[PDB]
């Protein structure tokens, strides 16, 4: 409508009566997604893009968020004639998501840098004409709902997002761009993603969001930056607590990344009494394994930073390990580059920044160092394993000299009396190898002098020498 209990909650004055209004749309049949992002939207406009006349909270008076919202109600259902595309079973066809998306996609400027922050929203929508990509993903959706279409949802992988709908919620439909430079695929299923093992599909173990898991990507979505050094303390409180209430009620227990989130919260600033960020990081892992195969990555790239940020380098080797233990059962496709840029940057600067450190204190005399540990140097070898492993069968390579140089650094990181403790064992501390690049290497990795040509030879597959 908006409807007159949901009008009962304003002016919002502050972070708990934003709280108190996503309490109430939660407690509802279909809590309303286009209220709530404009809102959001909204509250991080006036904390983190422009604070200019900010006191403490930038009131959202009823009058103001009522006519954001029949703006754009009003230019969807002016845009979507419903009578042209009849639902058969209280189901949507895919002509209409086709048609939602295009009403969007159209409304966008033409021209804008579709990387900055603050353009998540339908508040971004609404007042500037820009959104980001999974941003235009949310408004198909929320705008299906300001329709009546019950069925369409927003569906959600770690670097793209789409819609299903349709008969059981079994249709897929892209909405949206992806990348820069990959031609869009509107209007067509994910399946071709899916079936070629790509990262960016997960082999299907991607997520399918009802209304409540959608309310929770919006509030994953709020960013508090206001620069490159300064974050909103008001946003990240708002966010925080938006977490907890959505944590409370249930809605987070199929989304590992929301959990990721709260848990880096709560790093930063802990609420009394909650549980740590290690048990949030790890409820997160739990809940990868439990719903989605174990197919996802960043549950364990989050474990992974926070033990990073906290010099628990053992701890972050074994983490990391377990993001390539889940990369090698994956091809590594074309759009896929967003998890390799992640994996590149660990492979290739933080673990050589971490392990340089690590020898630093050693020298100092350090007691139960990464360094002396041989699980460490099993840890660090799962780890090229699962990235090589990805790598076979994939339809582009992975490898090349510029990750041998690091390989060489981090192994001679550790001496030859430290990794000779490492049992390799084959199929069909002890380790095996998948990859039959590590297979070919493992007489290498134990030598007191480590032969730099031959490793860079053995990970690159590279044939002759000069
Ligand atoms: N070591 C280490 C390490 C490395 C990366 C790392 O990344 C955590 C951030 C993960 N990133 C995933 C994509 C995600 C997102 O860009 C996204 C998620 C799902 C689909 C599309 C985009 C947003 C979710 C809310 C709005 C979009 C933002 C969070 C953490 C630790």
């Not at 639902?87 to 840098?113: A, H, Q, T």
């Not at 020898?359 to 799962?382: K, T």
């Not at 134990?446 to 053995?458: D, E, P």
């Amino acid at each position: 409508g908006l409807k007159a209990a949901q009008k009962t909650l304003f002016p919002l004055r502050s972070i708990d009566d934003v709280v108190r209004l996503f309490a109430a749309e939660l407690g509802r049949e279909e809590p309303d997604l286009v209220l709530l992002s404009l809102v959001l939207g909204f509250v991080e406009h006036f904390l983190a893009v422009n604070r200019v006349g900010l006191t403490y909270f930038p009131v959202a008076d009823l009058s103001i968020i009522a006519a954001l919202y029949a703006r754009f109600t009003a230019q969807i259902r002016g845009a979507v004639d419903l009578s042209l595309y009849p639902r058969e079973g209280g189901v949507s066809s895919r002509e209409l998501v086709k048609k939602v998306s295009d009403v969007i996609w159209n409304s966008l400027s033409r021209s804008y840098f579709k990387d900055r922050a603050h353009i998540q929203s339908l508040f971004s929508f609404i007042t500037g004409t820009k959104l980001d990509s999974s941003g235009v993903a949310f408004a198909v959706v929320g705008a299906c709902q300001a329709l009546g279409l019950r069925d369409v949802h927003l569906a959600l992988s770690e670097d793209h997002a789409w819609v299903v709908f349709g008969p059981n919620g079994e249709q897929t439909a892209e909405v949206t761009w992806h990348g820069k430079g990959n031609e869009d695929r509107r209007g067509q299923t994910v399946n071709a993603g899916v079936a070629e093992r790509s990262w960016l599909y997960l082999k299907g173990s991607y997520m399918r969001c009802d209304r409540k898991m959608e309310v929770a990507f919006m509030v994953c979505a709020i960013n508090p930056s206001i620069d490159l050094h300064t974050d909103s303390l008001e946003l990240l409180q708002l966010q925080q607590k938006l977490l907890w209430l959505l944590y409370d009620l249930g809605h987070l227990e199929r989304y590992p990344m929301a959990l990721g989130n709260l848990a880096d919260l709560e790093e930063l600033e802990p609420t009394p009494g909650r549980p740590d960020p290690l048990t949030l990081y790890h409820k997160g892992i739990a809940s990868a394994k439990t719903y989605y195969r174990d197919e996802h990555i960043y549950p364990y790239m989050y474990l992974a930073g926070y033990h990073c940020r906290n010099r628990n380098v053992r701890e972050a080797l074994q983490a990391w390990a377990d993001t390539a233990t889940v990369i090698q059962d994956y091809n590594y496709c074309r759009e896929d580059e967003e998890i390799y840029k992640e994996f590149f940057e660990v492979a290739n600067d933080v673990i050589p920044n971490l392990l340089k450190e690590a020898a630093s204190l050693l020298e100092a005399g350090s007691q139960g160092s990464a360094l002396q540990d041989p699980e460490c140097f099993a840890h660090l070898l799962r780890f090229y394993d699962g990235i090589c492993k990805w790598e076979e069968g994939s339809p582009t390579p992975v490898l090349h000299v510029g990750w041998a140089t690091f390989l060489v650094q981090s192994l001679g990181r550790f001496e030859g009396q430290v990794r000779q403790k490492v049992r390799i064992v084959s199929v069909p501390p002890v380790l095996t190898f998948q990859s039959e690049k590590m297979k070919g290497m493992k007489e290498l990795l134990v030598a007191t002098k480590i032969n730099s040509s031959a490793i860079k030879l053995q990970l690159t597959a590279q044939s002759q020498v000069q």
